[PDB]
Amino acid sequence: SSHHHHHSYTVTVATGSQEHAGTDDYIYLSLVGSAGCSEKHLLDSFERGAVDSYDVTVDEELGEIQLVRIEKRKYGSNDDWYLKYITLKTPHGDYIEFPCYRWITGDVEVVLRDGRAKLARDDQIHILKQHRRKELETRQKQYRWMEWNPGFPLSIDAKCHKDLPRDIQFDSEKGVDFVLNYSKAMENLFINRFMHMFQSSWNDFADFEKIFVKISNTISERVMNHWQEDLMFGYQFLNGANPVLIRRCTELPEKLPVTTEMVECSLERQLSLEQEVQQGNIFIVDFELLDGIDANKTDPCTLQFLAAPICLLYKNLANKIVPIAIQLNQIPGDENPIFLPSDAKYDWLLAKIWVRSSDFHVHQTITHLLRTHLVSEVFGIAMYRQLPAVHPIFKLLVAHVRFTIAINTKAREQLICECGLFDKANATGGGGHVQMVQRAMKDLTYASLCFPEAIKARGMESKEDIPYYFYRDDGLLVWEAIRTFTAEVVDIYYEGDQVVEEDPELQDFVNDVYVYGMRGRKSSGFPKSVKSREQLSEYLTVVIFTASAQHAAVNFGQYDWASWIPNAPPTMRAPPPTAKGVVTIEQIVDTLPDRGRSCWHLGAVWALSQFQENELFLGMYPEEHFIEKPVKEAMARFRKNLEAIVSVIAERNENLQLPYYYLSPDRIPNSVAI
Numbered sequence: 248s249s250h251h252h253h254h255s256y257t258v259t260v261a262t263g264s265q266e267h268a269g270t271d272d273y274i275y276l277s278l279v280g281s282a283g284c285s286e287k288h289l290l291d292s293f294e295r296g297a298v299d300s301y302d303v304t305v306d307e308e309l310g311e312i313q314l315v316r317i318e319k320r321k322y323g324s325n326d327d328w329y330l331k332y333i334t335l336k337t338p339h340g341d342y343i344e345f346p347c348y349r350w351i352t353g354d355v356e357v358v359l360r361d362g363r364a365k366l367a368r369d370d371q372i373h374i375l376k377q378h379r380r381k382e383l384e385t386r387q388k389q390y391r392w393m394e395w396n397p398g399f400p401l402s403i404d405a406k407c408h409k410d411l412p413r414d415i416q417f418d419s420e421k422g423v424d425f426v427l428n429y430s431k432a433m434e435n436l437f438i439n440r441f442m443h444m445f446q447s448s449w450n451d452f453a454d455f456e457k458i459f460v461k462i463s464n465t466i467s468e469r470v471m472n473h474w475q476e477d478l479m480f481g482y483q484f485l486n487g488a489n490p491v492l493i494r495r496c497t498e499l500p501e502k503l504p505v506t507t508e509m510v511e512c513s514l515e516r517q518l519s520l521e522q523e524v525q526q527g528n529i530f531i532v533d534f535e536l537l538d539g540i541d542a543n544k545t546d547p548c549t550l551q552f553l554a555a556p557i558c559l560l561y562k563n564l565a566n567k568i569v570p571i572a573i574q575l576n577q578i579p580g581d582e583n584p585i586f587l588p589s590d591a592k593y594d595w596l597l598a599k600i601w602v603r604s605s606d607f608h609v610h611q612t613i614t615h616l617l618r619t620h621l622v623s624e625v626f627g628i629a630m631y632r633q634l635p636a637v638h639p640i641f642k643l644l645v646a647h648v649r650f651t652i653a654i655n656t657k658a659r660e661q662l663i664c665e666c667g668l669f670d671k672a673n674a675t676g677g678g679g680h681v682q683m684v685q686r687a688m689k690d691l692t693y694a695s696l697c698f699p700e701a702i703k704a705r706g707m708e709s710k711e712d713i714p715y716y717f718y719r720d721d722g723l724l725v726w727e728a729i730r731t732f733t734a735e736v737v738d739i740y741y742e743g744d745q746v747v748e749e750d751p752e753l754q755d756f757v758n759d760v761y762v763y764g765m766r767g768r769k770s771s772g773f774p775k776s777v778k779s780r781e782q783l784s785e786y787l788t789v790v791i792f793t794a795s796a797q798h799a800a801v802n803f804g805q806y807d808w809a810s811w812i813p814n815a816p817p818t819m820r821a822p823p824p825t826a827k828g829v830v831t832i833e834q835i836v837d838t839l840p841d842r843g844r845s846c847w848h849l850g851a852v853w854a855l856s857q858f859q860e861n862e863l864f865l866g867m868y869p870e871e872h873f874i875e876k877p878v879k880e881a882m883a884r885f886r887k888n889l890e891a892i893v894s895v896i897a898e899r900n901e902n903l904q905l906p907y908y909y910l911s912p913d914r915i916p917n918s919v920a921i
């Protein structure tokens with residue numbers, strides 16, 4: 248597809264591969280040399296995926312080339328042009344590359360530095376210092392902060408996807424489109440007939456299983472057959488879709504008045520409950536955050552209900568963690584019983600179903616939305632505002648914030664907006680899901696996002712004591728691989744800690760995240776400034792890990808584990824049981840979501856779990872912002888490292904009844920894009 252035009256600099260221009268990447272409009276190129284600029288030469292039709300070469304000879308001698316300038320002048324229609332990169336081969340024999348990876352509308356001229364990475368401190372001539380300063384001044388008018396809802400992290404200043412800068416939109420306007428992807432998911436799953444039966448209950452578990460067997464995958468079929476098993480219930484806290492809430496229990500809360508006699512049948516070591524606690528064998532999962540959140544009222548006909556359960560869990564003689572007591576609300580009472588696996592069959596099944604519906608809410612809104620998407624958009628915005636394209640940290644982070652602002656904005660326009668599709672199936676729809684974010688912000692700390700540290704704060708770090716925590720195990724290896732990569736990057740570009748402390752754009756980028764993203768909350772623990780290479784290396788690992796590995800661990804298991812509804816009910820249509828011996832299976836069915844919500848849930852988890860045809864997986868950096876040998880060798884090592892992790896995860900999972908593969912580096916996107 249390479250087209251050479253001969254008629255001197257050799258100027259090659261690479262157009263992009265995406266749908267509308269090509270243009271028919273006139274293209275003018277200029278060279279800014281150390282010794283004076285050049286004319287506005289007309290290269291002249293750049294089709295998608297092209298590589299066009301033009302011979303260009305200048306009316307004067309320019310010296311070393313500092314900048315390349317691009318201008319697009321309409322021809323007929325307004326045709327946007329995606330520009331990958333420009334190269335020159337000079338009369339002296341020098342090859343210089345200028346990375347772009349931006350959308351050129353006719354609105355603004357584009358000016359690109361040669362792709363070596365440069366700190367402000369490197370630029371001492373006016374030609375470069377003015378470009379750098381004018382680039383940031385332009386970023387900061389283009390990428391602005393805005394509060395979408397009160398108390399939230401701040402987000403991009405755009406009502407809808409259309410108003411975003413083209414540079415950060417999706418390559419097609421509705422290529423990723425929640426409202427179409429959800430309904431299209433519901434044809435493929437073939438539950439178009441139940442889409443609008445928001446009043447019809449599944450006749451019994453069989454009637455829903457008819458629908459599900461058609462559409463089951465490996466894990467979701469295993470969940471269909473084993474979801475009533477306590478072993479599976481417990482298993483998900485460590486290795487399902489939301490494996491971050493459990494923690495080792497060091498003293499039993501006063502709010503859980505559970506005694507040894509109540510759970511002697513579960514205990515297996517000839518020890519009392521208190522002794523089991525002192526020994527590290529008791530674990531807890533406490534949904535107090537759900538205490539007081541409003542239940543969804545958007546539908547007058549159907550009543551939605553929420554709980555705030557306490558779930559006590561026991562590591563048995565086989566080192567599996569099983570549930571041994573469940574209180575469905577926070578304030579103990581006689582109408583808030585402690586349900587036990589010794590209870591009537593449906594009392595304890597129903598109790599376990601409420602804990603699963605609770606895990607789901609906390610997962611979707613907090614773990615998923617707040618703590619991977621919103622957090623990531625924050626980093627993305629601060630990055631575009633404060634880090635010019637030539638800065639090493641922009642070259643590094645930009646891959647990892649690709650379509651992050653675009654997806655989050657399509658969601659605020661459509662999914663979690665007022666009267667959005669989130670309200671169709673979830674009991675935190677209506678507004679409850681905004682309160683959850685507000686009250687969760689108090690816990691959104693920098694330390695919580697340091698994966699090892701965060702695992703230890705939950706007392707879950709010991710592999711000897713807790714040996715089936717595959718989420719932890721894989722996370723730790725991917726965290727360290729990123730840790731090794733970012734540290735190689737900072738060490739390449741920052742020879743000492745003083746260089747890190749004295750980098751104004753790096754400090755502003757970090758200060759932007761703390762003041763605007765996190766609202767300047769002292770309790771957030773975010774750095775106001777980074778003053779060492781170690782601290783920056785860790786900071787960078789936080790950004791990348793949150794955006795790839797954490798987002799992929801909590802996002803791509805959604806269909807595996809929530810497509811069998813009774814294992815992850817988005818909503819509940821009856822309040823929790825206040826007493827034992829009352830609940831019947833017929834009453835559990837009528838509590839579970841109707842056919843209608845059930846289907847909107849199924850498309851949702853289906854769509855959200857898909858990979859794009861040409862997804863970019865961790866360490867795949869087709870856009871060469873970096874072009875220098877040492878950082879490209881760091882990246883190669885990063886690729887070799889991630890693959891070694893893929894080999895050990897695959898070896899592990901061949902031995903497992905239910906493989907954990909969400910954090911296998913070959914399935915972890917670079918960024919939050921769905």
Ligand SMILES: [Fe+2]
Pocket residue numbers: 620798802919920921
């Ligand atoms: Fe996501």
